[PDB]
Each structure stands twice: as structure tokens, then as C-alpha cells.
Amino acid sequence: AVYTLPELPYDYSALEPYISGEIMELHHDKHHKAYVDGANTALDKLAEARDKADFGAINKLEKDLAFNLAGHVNHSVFWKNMAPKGSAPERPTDELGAAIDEFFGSFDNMKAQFTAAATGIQGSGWASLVWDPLGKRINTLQFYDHQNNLPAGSIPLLQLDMWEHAFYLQYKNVKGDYVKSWWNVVNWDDVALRFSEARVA
Amino acid sequence: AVYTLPELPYDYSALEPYISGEIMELHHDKHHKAYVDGANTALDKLAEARDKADFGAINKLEKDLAFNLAGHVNHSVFWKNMAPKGSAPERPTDELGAAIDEFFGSFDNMKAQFTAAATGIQGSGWASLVWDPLGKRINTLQFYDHQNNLPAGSIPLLQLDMWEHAFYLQYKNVKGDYVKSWWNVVNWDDVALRFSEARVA
Amino acid sequence: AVYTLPELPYDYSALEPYISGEIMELHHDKHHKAYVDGANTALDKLAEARDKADFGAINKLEKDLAFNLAGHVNHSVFWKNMAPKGSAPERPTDELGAAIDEFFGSFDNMKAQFTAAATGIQGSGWASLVWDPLGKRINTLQFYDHQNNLPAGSIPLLQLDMWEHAFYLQYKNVKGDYVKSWWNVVNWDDVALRFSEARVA
Amino acid sequence: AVYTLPELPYDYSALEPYISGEIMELHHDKHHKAYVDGANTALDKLAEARDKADFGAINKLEKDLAFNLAGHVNHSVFWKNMAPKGSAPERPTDELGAAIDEFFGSFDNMKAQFTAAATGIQGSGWASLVWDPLGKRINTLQFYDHQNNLPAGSIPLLQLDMWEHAFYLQYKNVKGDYVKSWWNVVNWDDVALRFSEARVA
Ligand SMILES: [Fe+3]
Ligand SMILES: [Fe+3]
Ligand SMILES: [Fe+3]
Ligand SMILES: [Fe+3]
């Protein structure tokens, strides 16, 4: 209804051998699709709650909305944050490259901090590079599940799915290798565009 | 310092009798100030980590940042969302008023849903009215603590602090009385401004 | 129905001036009573769900049960963990005293660790001294809200309510003073009995 | 070391075809071992803190302990709760069987409620059947991660790991098929033993 499932800007197997087509197909067709259906159903439920003036399940509906909508947002950004190797620059440049050096010291320091945040998660979660509109800087955050451990108003620039379904079929328990191979398919041109729009408040 | 304590646009007792000046002074001078110092320290510690190449406490630092920065963000909007009785419109009008009718059916439905979300929180949290950039709609979210149960990219329009320190000294355990009194001091002018700036007309 | 509200083993004002009778009366009559009613209602809801074979709200009911039942358990232990000054020994002795020296080094070290855990909570929570039946030792835990951040099978020995409603009317934002005064009314004889029953697996 | 990795009461492929031996080996040798090392380190760090009188990282250490110790506890029960098909009763009997009928109406109702709690988890977690010492009854709880959404004093009787690593390699995203297969390998003899020891006859 309100939300729709976006299609991939590339073929399921375009990111191989870094991320297999098997994961991509299940991740998109099964997982992401579930969040879209869940977010719409949450809205229908909230609408029905208003019509009958019965808000007894408000706590459930607010979590259903937050969980599924955050899942939809996180994955929509995730797909575009990636592109076949060689399709995008190896490292950030111009506006983004300068900003990263300012807030992290160097590209490698930002990479090290992002990596540490990605692998240290106790449970499901995400590693994220966001624009802080209040402090007007780029920070790294560690999301719990899809909707926890983040300030309101945070604009996602670059995100990495650290839920097990994103790497288990390929890397098993070795998260370190998954994050290692992911750096090869990061679409820095997409992050650059997000950084530009985020900068206008 | 990257973050600083904003000054109140009114005196501590300007919201009486709806909200005690005793609560306002402690809430701003003590509580809000703490989030600013915490958020600044979190960034300093992270800079320390990168310099030493030691990210052992990454999980702690990332939570310290999200919790404190979110507290800073939540209270900053909270102060401006309020104004003395009779100094602002008693009802949303124009663009904001039309949007609320479109996404909630009416102003009464919006209030009912917002109130239900406020009083039903199991633990500390917030009742929020945010702009959803993906679905291009206004939704109500129920924050847990300061940084939980919310999608990234959510832009706060109207917020209500449901932590016990925000009402205990005056209303005790009666959460219902607190929320009912709070509706009288809502500055709809500020909300309308945030609504327009959330998407630039 | 299943759960009932236990009465205080002393008068509301018996713990003064460390904890006022005003807090005790509201905490018991209003707060604890709410958890008992909530826990029973959660069971009725789960029973009704089984009768009609409709488990659509299972996520809500499981959290309602866990939140309210944990609240009931935590406060039931909290009341007995306290007694008027002079009614119980100032420090633990015999079995308990020996165990504390073994797992913490000294009584003061356990006090310091417990205090640090109590005051550092980011949001609502509890500081707790529990018996770990797997490791067969006494550990300190920091509960989030009432039902988070604890292993299953943990047996509560000594607990301190760190929710704002437990100290705000008296100590305001100064948590440090609340914890400081609480040590004066700890009923070590009650903790000793809990330690004995916990030890038998 | 305070904690140690328990050995499996059967071979890795003993539960096939219901649960793959590939999953069993990684789950025990890699995953469970990690919680043991983490729990031990958490205690060593806490001892370090007391010695230095520096509890600055108390919030991190307390979460590290709860998360890892809970993982250790949850998996220890999980292994024993299972046995090869045909090596244990296919249905609860005697004392345990009568108790389930008393608290759930029937075995089918218990299974339905347990299944609903298992498949509906939003994120990582567990479906648990515990003994409630306060209410003197058997309840179903839905754990988040390893250490969330549960009352203190809860004694685990039967547990099901709903984290993605527990079923992804064999069942993919179909959680329903995993839970349906798992019922075939439940060792009701072990559950009955834990039920009796939870309250000593
Ligand atoms: Fe994912
Ligand atoms: Fe506040
Ligand atoms: Fe309390
Ligand atoms: Fe597991």
C-alpha cells in the first residue's frame, strides 16, 4: 500500500565472489519483502485502531511499525551502497573524502572503526556511517536489530547488514571475512550522493 | 566542544501551572546538561581509540554516543515544542493541520493515538510524532529510553518526555494527568516550522 | 488470581530518614500493585489465546508477562531486603560473609562494585547480587527495566531499585545519595536466608 | 576457569535428518565455546576493576557477563533437551505430563503456544518453557538475544534456539519447518528431570 519493495540495481550474482547470488536472492525476495508487508500491515492496524477507538494493542503496533519500517529503510540503503567491483571508485573522493579525513583522520581509520563496530555486535545488528545534523559531522553507529541504538534524525550514508542471514551460508561463523570482502563492493558514488543531500539539513 | 546546552526560550516557571518550574529547572540544568557532557566525552574517547588503534570498548562507546546524543536531540526538540498557554495556537492550522487530517483522519484521532502511545510505555521513553521521508507521511513512534524503537532517518516534529523525572514531582504516578496538562502548552507554531523544514516545502 | 500483592513487613515510615514514607506508600500501593494486576491479566490473555486458537498477539503477551512478572519478583525481594536500622547486622556474617570475601575479596569491594553498577545505569533498572547456580558463585548484575540483561536461572539475593520513582521525590537527580542512604537499611539476615536456599541448587 | 564447555551426550550427526550435523558441529565447537571464553573474560575484567578501584567500564562488563553467561546457560540446556529420534518418549508422561495439562489445558495447546512464541521473534532469541517458583506454574517465555525478556529466578525446562545460525544452513528462512522438525528430537526424559529438580519433588 504505502511501502513498496524496490528492485536491485544489479543482478543477484553481480557481487560475486564477495557475496553470493544465493544470499542476495533470499535476502531480497524473502527478507526485505517481509519488512514491506509488515510495515503496511502495521499501518492498517493503526488505522483500524483509530476507527474503532481501541488502542489496546498500541505497544505491539508501535514496535511492529518500528521494526519492519526500520528493516525496510536499512535494506533499501544497503542495496544501493553496493555495486560490482570496478563500477565505483576504490576509495571516497572530493567532498566525501575530505569530510572523512576531517572526522576520522584518514580513510583507513574510519574503516578500522567501522569494522570494529560491525564485528563486535552482541546479537543482530548493523554497522552504520551517518550524518549527525545537530553536530554537523559524520559518526559511526552500531544498530541493535534494525531499530535500536540510534538518535532520531540520523541520516544513513553507508550501512552493513550484520544479521546472520547475510553471511552464514557463505562465511559461516567467520564474520571477519564477510566484512573483509564487503569493502570490495562498496559503491562510494552512492554514499557521495547521500552525503550531499544529508548536508542540506 | 562539539555539542552545547541550548538555552530555554522562556523562564523556568513560564509553563506553570501545567508544568512546574521546579521540574523545568532540574530537567534542563541537570538532566539535559548531562547528555551534552556525555555525548562530548563519547566522541573524545572514540578519537582516543582510533589514535591507539584499540577498539576493545567499541560496544560501550557506541552505546554511550547513541544514548547521550539521542538525549540531547530529544530534549532540544522538547523545549521548543512548548510555549506558555495563550502564546501559541491552541490547534494546528494550515499545512500542518491538513496533513494531520490526511494521516490520522482528524486532530482528535491524532491526539488519542499519541496519548495511548505515551501512557502505555513499559519503562522510560517518549511519545513522538515524526516525518517519514520514505513513506512521505506523518507517524507516531514510541521511543524506549532515548535511542530505541525507531527507524533511521526519522525527523522529530513533536515529542513528549515520558521518563519519570519529567512528571513525578508534580503528578506522581498519574501519567494521564501529565499528558492532559501538556497538550495545553504545545507550541503548534514550532511544530509547523519543523514540518516544513523536514522536507523544504 | 495467580499472583497476589504481599504486604510490607514494616510500616511505610519505618525506613526514615533514609527512605521516606511518601515514597514507600506510592511504591507499594501504586507501583507494585500494578505489576500484580498486569501479570494476572497477561495469563488470562494467554489462556484466552489458547481457547480460541488465536496467537496473533503472542509477542505482546509474552512481553507483558515478562515485564509485569519481573516487576512483581523484583519488588517482592526488594521489600524484604530492607529493615529499620539496627534491626539487622551492619555487615554480613557467617556463611554469607565468607562467600562475599571469596567472590569479591572483601565486603567493601562488593559494596563498591554494587554501587558502581547501580549508578551507571542508562535508563531504568536494578543493581543485583545473585547466585549463579552454574558457576556456583555470587555475581553482580545490572538489570535494564525489570526483565533485561540477566541469565536464566539467576536467583536474586540482594536488589536495589534504580527507577526514578524510587528516589526522585526525596533525592531528586542525585542517585549517589540515594544509594548511599540505602546501605543503612539493608536486612542482611534476609539475604543470608536467600543465600542458603539458593545454595541447594 | 570458572566456566567450561560441556561435551555433547551424542555425536554431531546423531540428530539427522531433523538437525544437520554440520550445524551441530559449528554450533557447539564454535558458538558455544565463544560464550564460555567471553563469560570467563568478563569475570577476569571485573576482578581487575575491583583491584584497581576503577569501575569506569562497569556497564560494558555487566552486559558482557549477562550476554555470555546467558548464552552458556541457554545452550547447555539446549543440548540436553535433545536426543536421537526413537531414543526418548514421543510424549510427556507422568508428573510432567499432568502439569502441562494443568497449565495449558493439553499437550497440543502447549505446543501451539510454544510454536507461536518461537516463530514470532523479531530479531534473535529463544522460545522457553520455564518453572515459575513464585506462581508455582509452568510458563512460556520469549527471550530476546540470550539475556532479555525474562524474570529473575526463572528455571529453564525446555529451550529452543531461534537465532539464525541454529537453522539457516538447512532450513533457510523457513522458521516453521525448523520448529516442526525439532519437536521430533525433544528428550522429554530430560525435561521431566529438570522439572523435578526445579522444585525438589
Ligand atoms: Fe538483512
Ligand atoms: Fe527528560
Ligand atoms: Fe520500583
Ligand atoms: Fe545458538
Short mmCIF file of C-alpha atoms in Angstrom, two decimals, chain C residues 11-166:
data_model
loop_
_atom_site.label_atom_id
_atom_site.label_comp_id
_atom_site.label_asym_id
_atom_site.label_seq_id
_atom_site.Cartn_x
_atom_site.Cartn_y
_atom_site.Cartn_z
CA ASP C 11 5.33 0.38 58.47
CA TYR C 12 5.70 2.76 55.49
CA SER C 13 7.70 5.22 57.60
CA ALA C 14 9.91 2.64 59.36
CA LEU C 15 12.84 3.28 56.99
CA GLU C 16 13.03 7.04 57.57
CA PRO C 17 15.03 9.24 57.16
CA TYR C 18 16.83 7.05 54.60
CA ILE C 19 13.70 6.41 52.52
CA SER C 20 10.57 8.46 53.20
CA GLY C 21 7.14 7.03 53.92
CA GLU C 22 5.73 9.00 50.98
CA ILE C 23 7.84 7.00 48.51
CA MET C 24 7.17 3.69 50.27
CA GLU C 25 3.38 4.20 50.21
CA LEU C 26 3.27 5.16 46.50
CA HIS C 27 5.83 2.50 45.56
CA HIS C 28 3.86 -0.28 47.25
CA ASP C 29 0.21 0.80 46.85
CA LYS C 30 0.53 2.14 43.30
CA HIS C 31 3.56 0.62 41.57
CA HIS C 32 3.83 -2.94 42.90
CA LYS C 33 0.05 -3.37 42.77
CA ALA C 34 0.15 -2.55 39.05
CA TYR C 35 2.61 -5.37 38.32
CA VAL C 36 0.45 -7.94 40.11
CA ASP C 37 -2.65 -6.92 38.12
CA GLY C 38 -0.61 -6.90 34.92
CA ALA C 39 0.89 -10.36 35.46
CA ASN C 40 -2.54 -11.91 36.09
CA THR C 41 -4.09 -10.16 33.09
CA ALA C 42 -1.25 -11.45 30.90
CA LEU C 43 -2.04 -15.03 31.98
CA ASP C 44 -5.77 -14.55 31.32
CA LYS C 45 -4.92 -13.22 27.85
CA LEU C 46 -2.65 -16.19 27.13
CA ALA C 47 -5.36 -18.57 28.33
CA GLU C 48 -7.94 -16.87 26.11
CA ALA C 49 -5.48 -17.10 23.20
CA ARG C 50 -5.32 -20.88 23.65
CA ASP C 51 -9.09 -21.32 23.93
CA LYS C 52 -9.75 -19.58 20.61
CA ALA C 53 -6.54 -20.82 18.97
CA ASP C 54 -5.53 -17.25 18.13
CA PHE C 55 -1.92 -16.40 18.98
CA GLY C 56 -1.71 -13.24 16.86
CA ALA C 57 -0.69 -11.13 19.86
CA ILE C 58 1.84 -13.62 21.26
CA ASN C 59 4.75 -11.13 21.10
CA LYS C 60 2.79 -8.56 23.13
CA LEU C 61 1.53 -11.05 25.73
CA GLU C 62 5.00 -12.54 26.27
CA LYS C 63 6.47 -9.10 26.94
CA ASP C 64 3.53 -8.09 29.15
CA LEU C 65 4.04 -11.27 31.20
CA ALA C 66 7.82 -10.83 31.43
CA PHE C 67 7.65 -7.11 32.28
CA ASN C 68 4.95 -7.36 34.96
CA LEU C 69 6.09 -10.67 36.47
CA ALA C 70 9.69 -9.45 36.66
CA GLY C 71 8.39 -6.28 38.31
CA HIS C 72 6.47 -8.36 40.84
CA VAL C 73 9.51 -10.55 41.61
CA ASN C 74 11.98 -7.65 41.86
CA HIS C 75 9.87 -5.65 44.32
CA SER C 76 8.91 -8.68 46.45
CA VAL C 77 12.63 -9.25 47.06
CA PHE C 78 13.27 -5.50 47.49
CA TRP C 79 10.86 -5.12 50.44
CA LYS C 80 12.41 -7.98 52.43
CA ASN C 81 15.94 -6.87 51.57
CA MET C 82 15.25 -3.90 53.86
CA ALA C 83 14.59 -3.40 57.58
CA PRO C 84 14.71 -0.46 60.06
CA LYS C 85 18.27 0.49 61.02
CA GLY C 86 19.54 -1.54 63.97
CA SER C 87 17.11 -4.39 63.24
CA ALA C 88 19.74 -6.29 61.25
CA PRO C 89 23.56 -6.51 61.36
CA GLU C 90 25.57 -3.70 59.75
CA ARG C 91 27.63 -6.21 57.74
CA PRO C 92 27.15 -9.83 56.51
CA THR C 93 28.48 -12.66 58.67
CA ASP C 94 28.94 -16.44 58.86
CA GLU C 95 28.15 -18.25 55.57
CA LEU C 96 27.29 -15.12 53.55
CA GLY C 97 30.18 -13.04 54.90
CA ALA C 98 32.67 -15.76 53.96
CA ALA C 99 31.22 -16.19 50.46
CA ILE C 100 31.36 -12.45 49.78
CA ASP C 101 35.05 -12.30 50.79
CA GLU C 102 35.72 -15.23 48.46
CA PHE C 103 34.00 -13.90 45.34
CA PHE C 104 34.71 -10.17 45.82
CA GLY C 105 37.78 -10.02 48.06
CA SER C 106 36.11 -8.03 50.83
CA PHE C 107 32.75 -6.58 51.87
CA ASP C 108 33.85 -3.11 50.77
CA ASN C 109 34.89 -4.32 47.30
CA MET C 110 31.46 -5.90 46.79
CA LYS C 111 29.89 -2.65 48.01
CA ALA C 112 31.96 -0.60 45.56
CA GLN C 113 31.11 -2.84 42.60
CA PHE C 114 27.41 -2.93 43.50
CA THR C 115 27.35 0.87 43.86
CA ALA C 116 29.07 1.43 40.51
CA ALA C 117 26.56 -0.86 38.80
CA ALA C 118 23.63 0.92 40.46
CA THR C 119 24.58 4.49 39.49
CA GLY C 120 25.83 3.85 35.95
CA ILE C 121 22.50 2.63 34.54
CA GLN C 122 21.42 4.35 31.31
CA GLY C 123 17.66 4.33 31.81
CA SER C 124 15.51 2.40 34.30
CA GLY C 125 16.99 -0.65 36.01
CA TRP C 126 18.25 -2.54 39.06
CA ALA C 127 21.54 -3.39 40.73
CA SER C 128 21.51 -7.02 41.85
CA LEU C 129 23.55 -9.56 43.80
CA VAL C 130 22.62 -13.03 42.52
CA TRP C 131 23.59 -16.68 42.92
CA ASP C 132 24.90 -18.26 39.73
CA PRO C 133 23.95 -21.98 40.01
CA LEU C 134 26.10 -22.97 37.03
CA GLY C 135 29.31 -21.30 38.18
CA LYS C 136 28.27 -21.70 41.83
CA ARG C 137 29.29 -18.19 42.83
CA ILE C 138 27.84 -14.78 43.70
CA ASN C 139 27.83 -12.24 40.86
CA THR C 140 26.54 -8.68 40.45
CA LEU C 141 24.17 -7.89 37.57
CA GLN C 142 22.69 -4.69 36.14
CA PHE C 143 19.07 -5.23 35.05
CA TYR C 144 17.56 -2.99 32.37
CA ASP C 145 13.99 -2.01 33.29
CA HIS C 146 12.77 -5.13 35.15
CA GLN C 147 13.36 -8.01 32.75
CA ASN C 148 16.54 -7.39 30.75
CA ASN C 149 20.28 -8.07 30.97
CA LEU C 150 20.24 -11.27 33.08
CA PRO C 151 20.83 -15.04 32.53
CA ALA C 152 18.02 -17.55 33.09
CA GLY C 153 18.17 -19.37 36.41
CA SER C 154 19.60 -16.39 38.31
CA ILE C 155 18.49 -16.34 41.96
CA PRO C 156 18.16 -12.82 43.46
CA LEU C 157 19.89 -12.33 46.82
CA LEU C 158 20.00 -8.52 47.20
CA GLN C 159 18.41 -5.94 44.87
CA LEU C 160 18.22 -2.15 44.62
CA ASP C 161 15.50 -0.38 42.63
CA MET C 162 17.11 2.31 40.47
CA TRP C 163 13.96 3.52 38.71
CA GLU C 164 13.40 7.26 39.25
CA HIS C 165 10.12 6.81 41.16
CA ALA C 166 12.19 5.13 43.89
#
